Amino acid sequence: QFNPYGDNGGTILGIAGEDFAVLAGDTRNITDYSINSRYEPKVFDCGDNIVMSANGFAADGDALVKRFKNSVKWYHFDHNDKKLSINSAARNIQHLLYGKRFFPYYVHTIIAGLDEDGKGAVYSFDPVGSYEREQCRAGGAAASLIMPFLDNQVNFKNQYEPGTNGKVKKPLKYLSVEEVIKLVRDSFTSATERHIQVGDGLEILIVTKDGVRKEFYELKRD
Amino acid sequence: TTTLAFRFQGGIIVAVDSRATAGNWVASQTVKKVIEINPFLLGTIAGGAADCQFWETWLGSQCRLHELREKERISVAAASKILSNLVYQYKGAGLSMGTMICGYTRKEGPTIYYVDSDGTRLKGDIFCVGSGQTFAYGVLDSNYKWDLSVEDALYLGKRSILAAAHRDAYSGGSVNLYHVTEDGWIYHGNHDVGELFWKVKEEEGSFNNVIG
Amino acid sequence: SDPSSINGGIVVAMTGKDCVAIACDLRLGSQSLGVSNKFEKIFHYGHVFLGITGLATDVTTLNEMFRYKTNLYKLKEERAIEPETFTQLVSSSLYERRFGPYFVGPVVAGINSKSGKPFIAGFDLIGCIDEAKDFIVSGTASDQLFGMCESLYEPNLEPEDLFETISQALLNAADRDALSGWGAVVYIIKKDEVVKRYLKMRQD
Amino acid sequence: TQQPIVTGTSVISMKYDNGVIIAADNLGSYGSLLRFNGVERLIPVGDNTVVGISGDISDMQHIERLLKDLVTENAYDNPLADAEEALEPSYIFEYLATVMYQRRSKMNPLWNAIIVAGVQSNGDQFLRYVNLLGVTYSSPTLATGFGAHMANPLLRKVVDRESDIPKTTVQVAEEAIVNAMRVLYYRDARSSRNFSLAIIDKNTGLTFKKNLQVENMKWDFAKDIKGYGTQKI
Amino acid sequence: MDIILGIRVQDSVILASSKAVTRGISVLKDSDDKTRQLSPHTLMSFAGEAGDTVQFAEYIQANIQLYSIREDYELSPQAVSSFVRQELAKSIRSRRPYQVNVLIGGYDKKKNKPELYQIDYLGTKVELPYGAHGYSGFYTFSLLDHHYRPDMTTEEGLDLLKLCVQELEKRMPMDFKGVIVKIVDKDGIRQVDDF
Amino acid sequence: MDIILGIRVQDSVILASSKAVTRGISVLKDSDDKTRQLSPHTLMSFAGEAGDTVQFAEYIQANIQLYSIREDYELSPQAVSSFVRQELAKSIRSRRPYQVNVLIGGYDKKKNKPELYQIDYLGTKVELPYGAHGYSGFYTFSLLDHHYRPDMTTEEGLDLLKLCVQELEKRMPMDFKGVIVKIVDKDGIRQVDDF
Amino acid sequence: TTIVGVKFNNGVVIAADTRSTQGPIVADKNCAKLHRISPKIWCAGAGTAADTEAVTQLIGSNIELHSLYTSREPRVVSALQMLKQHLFKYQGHIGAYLIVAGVDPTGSHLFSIHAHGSTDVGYYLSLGSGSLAAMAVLESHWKQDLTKEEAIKLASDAIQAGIWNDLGSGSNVDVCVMEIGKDAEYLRNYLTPNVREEKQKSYKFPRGTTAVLKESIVNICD
Amino acid sequence: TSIMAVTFKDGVILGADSRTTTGAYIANRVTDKLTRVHDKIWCCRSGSAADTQAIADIVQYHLELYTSQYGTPSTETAASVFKELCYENKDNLTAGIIVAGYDDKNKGEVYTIPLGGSVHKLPYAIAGSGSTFIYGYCDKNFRENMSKEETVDFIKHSLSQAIKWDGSSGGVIRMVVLTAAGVERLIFYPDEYEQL
Amino acid sequence: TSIMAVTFKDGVILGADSRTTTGAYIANRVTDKLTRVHDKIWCCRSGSAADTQAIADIVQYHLELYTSQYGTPSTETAASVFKELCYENKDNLTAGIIVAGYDDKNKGEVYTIPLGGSVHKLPYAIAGSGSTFIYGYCDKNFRENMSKEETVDFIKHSLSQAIKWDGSSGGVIRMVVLTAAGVERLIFYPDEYEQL
Ligand SMILES: *[C@@](C)(CO)[C@](*)(O)[C@H](Cc1ccccc1)NC(=O)[C@H](Cc1ccc(OC)cc1)NC(=O)[C@H](C)NC(=O)CN1CCOCC1
Ligand SMILES: *[C@@](C)(CO)[C@](*)(O)[C@H](Cc1ccccc1)NC(=O)[C@H](Cc1ccc(OC)cc1)NC(=O)[C@H](C)NC(=O)CN1CCOCC1
Ligand SMILES: *[C@@](C)(CO)[C@](*)(O)[C@H](Cc1ccccc1)NC(=O)[C@H](Cc1ccc(OC)cc1)NC(=O)[C@H](C)NC(=O)CN1CCOCC1
Ligand SMILES: *[C@@](C)(CO)[C@](*)(O)[C@H](Cc1ccccc1)NC(=O)[C@H](Cc1ccc(OC)cc1)NC(=O)[C@H](C)NC(=O)CN1CCOCC1
Ligand SMILES: [Mg+2]
Ligand SMILES: [Mg+2]
Ligand SMILES: [Mg+2]
């Protein structure tokens, strides 16, 4: 019998700073045990300082991004070129996903950008439209590997202040763009070591008030 | 999920956990399971995350349209029945929703309505809904009285979620407290189980099963 | 009805400079119901330490079995069994039940008393030995542990530092798994002293 | 819900310095039966694009008609149909990709794997893949079916990344493709000796080669092999 | 067979077990005692598949009584629980396993300490301050997490047990026809007739 | 939803309906009223699939009330029961049928006679001196076969009903949390508060 | 797995990758798939990991006892016969896919065995998930009358094809050369083209970061 | 597989392709499907490689032990041993075997043993997946008491067609000639037989 | 079924057996599987009798309506209409049809349409259950630009073998000759073709 879904592998990662936000994703694309492409981007600039990635089944992923990109376009036409805020984009995406509740897009979606106070924002979705704003989110095949590392290093979970008898927690603070990119690169190299569907290359999209910058890094090709 | 809400002398207490699951994977620890429909209406949610989130946000829109059309805030009964009639249309399609529409109006007084995705709609004084409802019921029922103070009632709701957060593997993260009075709902803060458990253990002398 | 994920639990092991560490959580449940918060998963036979995850009845049975076998070993050999030798014994015993296996994920850890070399190893349920320089992971949050260990770990860590790394690897991995947690224990093993520490972790 | 009946096997392709190469054998299999031997599975669109199709042949013939009809429709009310407003490889691909995904979304797929090879108007090499699921991807080398498993490894030794494309000539690239086709003939049970090859260069244009054969085959070592183990005679 | 509870307090172990025996849409009996005395200071309650439960309980009882006669000595609760666990651990990989869950409440005379062991049909043993099998645990564990203290008396333990039964009678779907309560301490085993 | 009974006596119809609403291993409510007043002298109790029950009961209620307003006249119990049956008879061959069983107790003011109708989810109507849906009937029918007389009073009918509830509380596996009893006679519908 | 075997002038060479998988996760990044049956008879294993280890040890044990009984150096055909009869008896349930090779008084030999107990003979062979990637290379570059150095190159190249192009294979290349008249040389980690790059950051925690409840000395002595 | 055995004036000739498949992948393109169970008693193997191989080994063992006690066995005897194994284990085997041998008294003989485990003595026999495509050709072209060169051409042309149409058949065409003269191995490559 | 169509010098000839089976029972032993969709455009039907019959009737209707408006249709046009029906209803049909026709410009033409609904223009075509057994024979014996007598012999010998080996084929051998001369029906009985 025909099976309409497939698994294209890979993994994605979003981190928010004080005045910036990053959305990273590996450039590998696979089916079963074969590599389809070593460089197939899945993190996209969607305009209005919103970056998006829908990792899982690439056909559904591309379809969704394509529809959201189109949603942004028609938002400008219908509302006098108004900038789509990150919170508004997130709610719009929920309706796109939930629209296919009974024949879902097999993707874990993450968007990143700046909120209306100019502060870094990461939103993340389940396949059918459930969403939540966070400082931190990993998605995709290697999400189970990367996410707990982020809890530890971004939100300082399970870390206490030395010599305080485990009574005072390590204080929360924003990370610099330099420190965030370090965590991203280490997250992906670690994931590449232990997950077969992750590797080849890493592409990071950084979002500041100035615009959207890109950075590329090699990953292990085995 | 574990969610509860109970009626008492001083209004309604509403308490929920904050964990989301994808099987045995902990998807989140910081999820909002109380939707604020209006200053006098709250909706707890349990079940499918998207179904709950989507349809309760939708419910709020229908309640807003009611007060625009009728120049009057919607009743708790009418609000709960909009949602129950909606899910009933989808009966069999596979929606998963366990909600408790809690609020106050002049004609009704403090009212709680249990509504779920297979069409059941029940008015009542006490309800616990979710994977850890039984754990919450155990603590809540054994300590419940109508004459509880606002201070004691708030704590009992908090302590009941904590109990379930501990035992139920699919509940935890943190406790979100609310108190509904004649003047509307009042938020009583987010309480992380990471600190709350040990605070309760030490002060109350409970949780002797755990290695202190 | 998946034996490996009924009771829940995790074990992790690491090497350092002239030392090894092995750690485990304390949860035993029946699917969603948490039952016990005292269920330790690490055992020792002389100076050789064995951690076991998976179906709890088999965890208990295998501990009793390896105690049995190592006791007879010591009586006949007139010496304590070494980690390398014990690793082979575990593999033999698991593969003996090839078509009716113990649903477990064992982890051997210890320092060879003759050479002084730190040693760790892991197994699948059927006996396949997984030897490693750096670390071994096992249990319902193995994916999580792999991610934590692969990023946090570095070679030649001192015992006091190694304790922090392994503890943080376990704690943060356990908090992303529903069937793991509810307390934790860490063994720091030096050539001729062993320190056992109970960690404070979130109880949900 | 379909099942493929008459099927075509591997389609292989790669980029080189000035353009792209694509190839596919001339077989129409009917399960294990090698039923039809004169099947062309490379279909040119204009003088700058070649669509290579594997999978169900009935659906391939449907796609042929769609492309044939696309050329006609593009010519309507279009004075620049053979110039600035000619059909690009990217246009042809996106059209097919749209169809493939729409059909899978209706649970009635075109049971194929497609590779669109061509050269754009600005000289850029175009090479992209799409299949019955609507999954799309691009790479310096692309292959379908057994080609993905056996051809790609060989073609990636020539062009392993983007920077290797300018360093690869048409002579080197074609030789790798022809070698890959031989390896596939050795090892794919639903392949044939006869095949077609197409080169789309930005300078010399479209060169379509028919009735090629796998040659220089190593079979001589077979005579020394006896039994499966202990047998000597 | 459904509800079996256990609470270990300062100087005793208290076992509560439901009296209902149901088959189909009929409660065949409402006065059923779901325990066996394994030895003078060791009591085992049980619940599970029909027939298997009593057959297993009595089989264990026979073996422990045989040991007592042979050695003229009572086996410790820890030793009995280990024996029981091993029997269930054998069973689970048999042609037809015993589908029986048990609680073993005993008073160790050498240590002068009460002990409560919870063992499921797989052979999963745990020592606990309080235990339960079946759906009961989903209510009683959280309740006991709150109200239990380690230094409680037997009388306090019975009130704590009454609190569990009341909750179960309120929230459980099935009518389990109340419970038979038994206390295990230094003076042996005795039944609370009025509960 | 589980236990709904009905007894027609000399001058009235008595409906008894269980108060429990259960889902999973939790009794969510123990004071649930499983009836709707269709008209001043006609009462319908119901039981079946969750959601369907109330949705159907209220839908019927709305239709009968609409008829009452339009004609300024109360429909006879026989007429109401026929309308209800037809709705269920349509339902059973729908895409998703109402899985609801009902009892319709009414007092016919023209005939001065009480009437009890039993209709299942298939649209199977029968007029009876006493009726029941679900597993209740397996106990109550034989009991009423013995103790029922056609010329009984309402007070005698309530004692006869108490005899049924006692038997169900003794032999039924599930705790149905007692019953709400309602009487339908020449003076209309009223609820017995102490049962 | 990816495993190969190549015959040459005066002997035979076998090779293998060093990746072990459980699902999509890499269980072991440097496992040993080349197995010694006897001093000059070695065996490359693919399939169920424990089965390849167990079946090769069992036959190796019985080969040793046979060699002592007969006062003769063991032959490859004996190992072949014992392996296939064992595997056949278990009707494929022992999931071992082996390439058996070695030198003995009869000469140099190269065979493959499948889990169900069927054996093949060849000058070049490949088994495992990356056998197609390897066989593509072997079919392209193999010729009659290979030298020792040429055979090692061809074998390792065939393993590399699996390492890079197959997700079920990775890490390093192990080789074992079995030449006639000489000792068999086992080249553990002959190539290591997948070295982990320097991490961006050291995650060494400040001492006292972890909260502790209890301490105790464990007694390991008598 | 495509396999066949053909009797002729001087004896009998066995023929086979060289393709082994695991699905659509060719695991071995130079397979030897003609196997010796005795000096001048050979067989063609089709079906499960593991099964036919295990059977042929047992038969070889039985006939070696027969020869030690009772001298050279007949071709019929060999076929009987094959049958006994195939028939008694029919539930667990997928083996279609053609037995061919040369006696001096009985000359060339061919016995075919299909899946069921039945025995059929024939002038010539064809079997395996690719044999379906050459029933028509072989029936029209076979003659009794052919010469060696005629029989080699008959097998070569037959297997050439079987290979051409069957995807599960291919590679080289191996043949084994059984006569009073001795045993002769023949091979024929694609470049020759494809263009017949 | 066994069916075939063969082009030759003067035009094209269609051939077929006459056996219709419902399981192992022969429902009709004198079936006419060669059907007219136009004056000199005929087809051979294999697969489901009901399906191929319903299709052929629709095609006959379309070509009659084509002739009323645009004059005589080409053989290619006829094959296209068959294809359109077979392809678009592939999920609900089991029809393997061979279309054969004679134009004056294009001479003899043969199009085969397998289960999928694909079209294949060929010099000759074979189809149906019994065709498997004659791929070898037909490939070796077919030549282009044969005479009428040669083509009749080719079809007769081919279908004779297909019938001999296929249980689902039998009875008489019907043939239909399409040339400029006109349309000629031929029949051949068992007593003749069996002993070829
Ligand atoms: C507890 C954790 C029980 O799991 C709660 O019910 C919790 C409530 C909640 C409310 C708001 C936001 C988040 C969470 N529910 C979940 O965490 C929920 C559990 C669940 C999963 C699947 C279900 O099948 C219908 C029913 C309940 N988790 C999710 O919804 C997760 C995050 N998402 C998915 O599993 C995505 N699936 C949903 C079903 O459709 C396919 C995709
Ligand atoms: C490559 C990696 C396959 O992807 C190789 O075949 C490799 C061979 C090998 C040999 C010796 C030492 C290490 C590695 N095989 C594996 O790594 C193997 C992959 C595999 C998983 C499941 C299989 O069948 C269900 C077959 C092959 N991995 C394992 O054997 C791991 C260590 N164990 C398991 O996955 C658990 N087993 C338990 C026994 O039942 C099968 C699953
Ligand atoms: C042709 C290819 C098919 O008819 C031949 O019969 C050929 C005969 C042969 C092969 C090698 C040496 C001598 C003779 N058979 C095969 O190539 C055979 C195909 C086959 C597989 C399974 C069968 O049913 C059990 C029947 C035929 N190939 C194999 O045996 C290969 C080596 N193994 C597999 O494909 C794995 N099988 C094992 C059995 O279970 C299914 C998977
Ligand atoms: C030979 C016999 C088989 O290949 C031919 O194809 C022949 C073609 C033919 C028959 C009559 C007139 C013109 C052409 N086909 C049959 O004889 C056919 C066999 C067949 C049955 C079902 C099939 O799949 C749907 C395919 C082939 N026989 C029939 O159609 C007979 C009349 N009916 C049945 O056997 C009843 N079938 C109806 C379809 O569902 C299964 C039961
Ligand atoms: Mg790889
Ligand atoms: Mg929890
Ligand atoms: Mg016939």
Side-chain angles (χ1 to χ4, degrees), chain I residues 104-124:
Chain I
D104 211 303
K105 179 173 279 157
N106 299 288
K107 305 287 170 184
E109 283 188 339
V110 171
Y111 296 82
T112 185
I113 300 166
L115 266 53
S118 57
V119 201
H120 303 273
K121 190 181 185 293
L122 299 169
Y124 77 102

Side-chain angles (χ1 to χ4, degrees), chain G residues 92-168:
Chain G
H93 292 291
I94 294 172
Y97 295 82
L98 307 171
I99 291 173
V100 188
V103 293
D104 59 49
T106 316
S108 76
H109 306 273
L110 178 59
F111 305 106
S112 61
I113 316 174
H114 284 209
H116 287 265
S118 61
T119 67
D120 288 332
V121 192
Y123 288 94
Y124 57 99
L125 299 167
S126 76
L127 260 42
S129 52
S131 71
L132 273 65
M135 183 55 71
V137 172
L138 294 170
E139 286 281 41
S140 292
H141 299 313
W142 181 91
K143 52 178 165 73
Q144 194 76 94
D145 300 321
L146 282 157
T147 65
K148 182 190 167 188
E149 280 72 30
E150 285 177 322
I152 294 162
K153 221 281 179 171
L154 179 61
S156 67
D157 280 359
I159 296 296
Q160 278 194 59
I163 284 165
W164 306 125
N165 309 123
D166 180 43
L167 302 179

